[PDB]
Amino acid sequence: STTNPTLADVAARMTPDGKIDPQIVEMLNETNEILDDMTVIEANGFTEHKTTVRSGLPTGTWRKLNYGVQPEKSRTVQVKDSMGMLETYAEVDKALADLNGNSAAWRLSEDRAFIEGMNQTQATTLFYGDSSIDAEKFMGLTPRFNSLSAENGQNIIDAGGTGSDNASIWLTVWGPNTLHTIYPKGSQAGLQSRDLGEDTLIDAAGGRYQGYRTHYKWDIGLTLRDWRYVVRIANVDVSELTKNASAGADLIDLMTQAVELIPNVGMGRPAFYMPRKIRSFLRRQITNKVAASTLTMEEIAGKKVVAFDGIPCRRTDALLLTEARVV
């Protein structure tokens, strides 16, 4: 019945009176920015990246004179975290791309949607990355911080909102020992767009079908050395946000409590991660807060948020707005 996918003769659909349409309007692509901002260091293990992390300090004792006090011992657990590889080959019939004379123009335009689908997927998975169910993928910021019971439960700040319509803000600190990405030894990250070249394909019938193919490897996992460098602001009920930080949960303060949750941002480099929705409301709320103080007439709308603390503030589309509420 249905043939999937695998590039039909709607190469025609992408054209004017003429060649491949250069100005196709990029609708489904979003400019979330972790992928540029996140750091990459090669993972240390085979299919993993091990990290030994101190679990218990020795206590010490006050000793009365004449009485040997006990020796002490640092109990210590170590934790490794897994990966996933993300790639596709991308094949096209050699004739369909050559015809109407648009061989390279098609290859390019088909490619851009590919880099974009790749970034969209890497990025949505980086925040809501599972593994008890998806198995194949590396596990991302939730649910390493899901339940409030976690040793980093103190690290998730309840925005206070409830119900199903509630976002969260993330603040992470990307650096080699606090939080970073990993690619295996030695497959390199990140995104390798290799072109396989023309090569023959095989028909269901038996027929040579002389045609193209392109690869898009991109294999990452994600180390969270210590959750202390990451704060989750769960349950920001977005229906309930009002710009006058009045009803619902205020952002500016809720956030400064997030800066205060991080032990000493020294390394490597911090970043805010909020859905475009919040980025707008945080904008409105900042100009709502300073207006009752000192803001100019022409700066009445307010500069769009850039450096919150200063920390760079990154807009991330690839961050679900209606995520289920945490308990």
Partner: protein, 140 residues
């Protein structure tokens, strides 16, 4: 006339009762709307012929669906009578302007059932159609 290996549905289907086409074309989007190309169009060729007890008619019509389950006419031909379908008779239907995922071809067969006949349905860009036209016509 170039033909897409993949958009070909009902390759040489022996339509005897009013059946739907063998394969159903599945686009990878909710509302492909490929009529807007002003370029794609369904073409049905005939083989060998719509021989039947007669006189019967065979109507080609494109069908949509949200999902590959329930179809509805979005284009049709009309009652092409029998004895208009000898081998080499193209019924061209321009692509309907508002397509959904999963298009198919149904053969609305008027009574009685056909005794013989294959049909080839596929979406192309475009048909090869060139009849010679008269000239003066005093000569020739």
């Amino acid at each position: 006339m170039i033909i897409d290996k993949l958009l070909q549905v009902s390759d040489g289907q022996a339509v005897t009762a009013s059946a739907a086409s063998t394969d159903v074309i599945d686009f990878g989007q909710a509302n492909p709307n490929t009529g807007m190309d002003d370029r794609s169009k369904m073409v049905i060729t005939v083989d060998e012929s719509a021989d039947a007890a007669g006189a019967a008619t065979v109507t080609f019509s494109v069908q949509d669906s949200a999902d590959n389950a329930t179809f509805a006419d979005v284009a049709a031909t009309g009652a092409i009578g029998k004895a208009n379908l000898a081998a080499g008779k193209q019924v061209v239907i321009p692509m309907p302007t508002k397509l959904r995922r999963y298009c198919r071809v149904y053969y609305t067969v008027a009574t009685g059932p056909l005794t013989a006949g294959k049909f080839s349905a596929q979406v192309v860009t475009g048909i090869q159609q060139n009849v010679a036209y008269p000239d003066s016509p005093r000569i020739a």
